[PDB]
Amino acid sequence: SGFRKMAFPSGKVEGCMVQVTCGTTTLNGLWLDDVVYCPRHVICTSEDMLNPNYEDLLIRKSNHNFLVQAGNVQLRVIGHSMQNCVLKLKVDTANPKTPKYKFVRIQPGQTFSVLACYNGSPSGVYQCAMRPNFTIKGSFLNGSCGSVGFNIDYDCVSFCYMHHMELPTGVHAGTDLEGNFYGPFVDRQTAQAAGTDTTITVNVLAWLYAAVINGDRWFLNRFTTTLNDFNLVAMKYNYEPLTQDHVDILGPLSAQTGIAVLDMCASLKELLQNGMNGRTILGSALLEDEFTPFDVVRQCSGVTFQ
Amino acid sequence: SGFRKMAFPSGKVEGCMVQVTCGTTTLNGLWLDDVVYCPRHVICTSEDMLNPNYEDLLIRKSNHNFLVQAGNVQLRVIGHSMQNCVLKLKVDTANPKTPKYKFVRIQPGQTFSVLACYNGSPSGVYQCAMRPNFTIKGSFLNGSCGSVGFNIDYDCVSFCYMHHMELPTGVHAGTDLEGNFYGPFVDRQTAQAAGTDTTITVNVLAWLYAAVINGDRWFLNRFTTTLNDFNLVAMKYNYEPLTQDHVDILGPLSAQTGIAVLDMCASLKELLQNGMNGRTILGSALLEDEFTPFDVVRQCSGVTFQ
Ligand SMILES: CC(C)[C@H](C(=O)Nc1ccc(C(=O)NO)cc1)c1ccccc1
Ligand SMILES: CC(C)[C@H](C(=O)Nc1ccc(C(=O)NO)cc1)c1ccccc1
Structure with a gap:
């Protein structure tokens, strides 16, 4: 007996977290097979975030500008592309710890576990819900972008969330792993307010x-x-x-x-x-x-x- | 920003969980170096638990009666001993996934993460506190005994709790990894009630x-x-x-x-x-x-x- 707010065991996802640095910005990435997924605003400065033109900012980036580190060992980037609001960094080594996985876009009201990370390193795990206004109520500091949310069924990890933004009201917004934001939010530092937080x-x-x-x-x-x-x-x-x-x-x-x-x-x-x-x-x-x-x-x- | 009830990443402990079967009883064990730790009441029947004489019950057990399974692979037991309320099963293979670890006896008011397991397999992770009455408010079903509680500092896992019992009131009691119960509780199915649950x-x-x-x-x-x-x-x-x-x-x-x-x-x-x-x-x-x-x-x- 007893009922607790319980997250999935996080080991399978821990082995997929890496650090991604572009210029002065460091955040987290997800390394699955030979691709590293991360928020595209890794290419921005804090100034850029007010009105970023991501296509133009990316023209100035080459493979060797994306520094990708798995623990203490550096990964070699051999290609890069933007899909919606995420970057896909092709590396020359497949993650040997890649679990069986899927990418899923969840519905409001569904729950998932978040592995909060900084500098590619896990900090903690907690349970979240996609709210009806398409925010989540998480625990994210500067550096946590690229942390992911997931469910596990038997041995298959279903990734459903990547963290991108904090709204001025303290709630959080992000994308699925195809890079499409949940809800109407954008990766721009602007006036975007959440709607009514209705109860599920x-x-x-x-x-x-x-x-x-x-x-x-x-x-x-x-x-x-x-x-x-x-x-x-x-x-x-x-x-x-x-x-x-x-x-x-x-x-x-x-x-x-x-x-x-x-x-x-x-x-x-x-x-x-x-x-x-x-x-x-x-x-x-x-x-x-x-x-x-x-x-x-x-x-x-x-x-x-x- | 945001503040959440957050557990430690559980991967380091996931790699230490095994299944221990003695006769008809299956629970979890913790495999560190060449020793598997588990609750001694694995040797009991449900009848035995009313008034068990553990020393006498153990006389009838030999190494080969303790079936220890790590995932799909069987471990060979080459010795066994009782320390307080835990059994230490010596196996012929050191856990290759053993993290840097310590055994710690925590004080009331301190917090820790629990990896809930069944049949040696992780089910979920959540945060707990050792209450001032030496219970914890967990989420444990039949089969979860031997699940452990822990903290992590950098790369060192401090194991502080092993789950043993549920009181009739729905709260939980257990030991440190030396096998000494927190509080006055015993591994006997008896009238033992928790004292005042004071706030920390x-x-x-x-x-x-x-x-x-x-x-x-x-x-x-x-x-x-x-x-x-x-x-x-x-x-x-x-x-x-x-x-x-x-x-x-x-x-x-x-x-x-x-x-x-x-x-x-x-x-x-x-x-x-x-x-x-x-x-x-x-x-x-x-x-x-x-x-x-x-x-x-x-x-x-x-x-x-x-
Ligand atoms: C959602 C919220 C509005 C609701 C609630 O507080 N109802 C409530 C209604 C009337 C009075 C009163 O004093 N009438 O005279 C006092 C409280 C509630 C219910 C369950 C758990 C949390 C919150
Ligand atoms: C611990 C508990 C006793 C405490 C509390 O509920 N106090 C309280 C006191 C007086 C009245 C009243 O209606 N007076 O007229 C109503 C409520 C409390 C405080 C914070 C969060 C949870 C609980």
């Missing part, structure tokens, strides 16, 4: 099931509701509308606990309208929304990765 | 400094206090007494922010007496106490491990 309703419900499985049940009540009735309350509290697709996804947790999804929705409705009254659920005084239904099933059943 | 005051203060560094400052007020005055309030709220040693440890964070430790204590006092009034601090509605002062400095400065 299906994840809150999954976490309430996790609470019941682990013995926290004070919030269960005698009520039920309907999708349309619940969603009137969801809207008031900036919760994402619950759909029949979401109900179906919660089916397995419903079956295990014997609590119908709409009954749990009625529990959530009362929690939103009345608050916690100073009580806690799984050690939290907030309704947690960065556990997916699949996260809960996985942790409550103890699946592993080889 | 110095860690709460460190987290409040982290909040200020990251822009959350609504809780700062015009007041100050004294150690003795604060501790009268700490006692009422089951907070550990603050000492001059704690004040000194917070010195660096005090210097960086310009907020005197006793001024932050006055902010904490008001938060305890008045609550959060529906507001949040670093995404939490509770006063978080599983960040140490060293954790905060580390995350706010981005130190790494090679």
Whole structure:
């Protein structure tokens, strides 16, 4: 028993992190097979970042200007190209530690693990969610760009995020590994503000099931509701509308606990309208929304990765 | 910016995890040099666990009864011995992935990362604190015994915890790597209840400094206090007494922010007496106490491990 915010084991990704330097700028890169992926703003100065013309800035760069270091050992760059907002640096050595991997573009509401790195070196690992406004709430300092987010299924690493930017409001924006930003954000130091940070309703419900499985049940009540009735309350509290697709996804947790999804929705409705009254659920005084239904099933059943 | 509950990169420990089977019981072991460490209750049946005589149960075990598997490859056991509540299984092959390591017995209030494993395979990583009542609040299912907790400094892994037991109340108990339990707990299925779960005051203060560094400052007020005055309030709220040693440890964070430790204590006092009034601090509605002062400095400065 016990339910914790849990990241994937990070060893498979640790062996892919390198340092990339272009001029005065150092950040992180991801070394898979004979390609190193990194944010294209490695080629910028701090001045450049206000209005960068990346195509023009890259004309002045040659292979030998990209210094790529894996631990203490230097990699030889034999080609470079820009794909959307990432650079692909072709090196003459395939990463011998390359795991089985895929590139995936995740949907808002899905979760992933971040390996925070500096100077190509891992600093820590934590769990994140792609928010409905396409930001993530991470922990990133200067030098952390190029840190990646990922999920693992058995022995295959699905890379879904690369870190690029911090907004003035303290939240974070980045791309998939094809270099396309999540949401409307751009790699320019400008006025770009995040939209409404809505709560991921299906994840809150999954976490309430996790609470019941682990013995926290004070919030269960005698009520039920309907999708349309619940969603009137969801809207008031900036919760994402619950759909029949979401109900179906919660089916397995419903079956295990014997609590119908709409009954749990009625529990959530009362929690939103009345608050916690100073009580806690799984050690939290907030309704947690960065556990997916699949996260809960996985942790409550103890699946592993080889 | 951003402040997250962050675990150490787990790759160095992943390469040390093995599966240990004795009869019908399978759990995890830690393979360092030519020794595998695991909980001694691997030799017990579920019946045995009510009143086990470990010395007598071990007489019936020989080296070849301990099946030790590293991934898909079997290790040969050439000796075994009991040290306190752990077994040390001598194998004929030194773990080629052995990192630089130490065994450490941590103090209540210190934090560490847990690599949750099943059948010798990593499942996830999360951050824990040794509570003042010598429990930890983990995420452990059947099969997770032998999972370990650790800190990393540069390239040296300090192992501090091995998981052994779940109490009927849902919290967790275990040993250091010399096999001595933290607190009064024993590896017997009996009535053993945890004492008062007091809050780690110095860690709460460190987290409040982290909040200020990251822009959350609504809780700062015009007041100050004294150690003795604060501790009268700490006692009422089951907070550990603050000492001059704690004040000194917070010195660096005090210097960086310009907020005197006793001024932050006055902010904490008001938060305890008045609550959060529906507001949040670093995404939490509770006063978080599983960040140490060293954790905060580390995350706010981005130190790494090679
Ligand atoms: C989302 C937030 C608005 C919600 C909440 O706080 N509701 C609340 C409603 C009414 C009162 C009151 O005092 N009425 O008189 C007090 C609190 C909530 C629920 C669960 C966990 C965190 C937050
Ligand atoms: C530890 C807990 C007891 C504390 C707290 O809730 N205090 C509180 C005090 C008075 C009232 C009230 O309504 N007075 O009229 C309401 C709440 C607290 C503080 C910060 C974060 C979590 C919890």
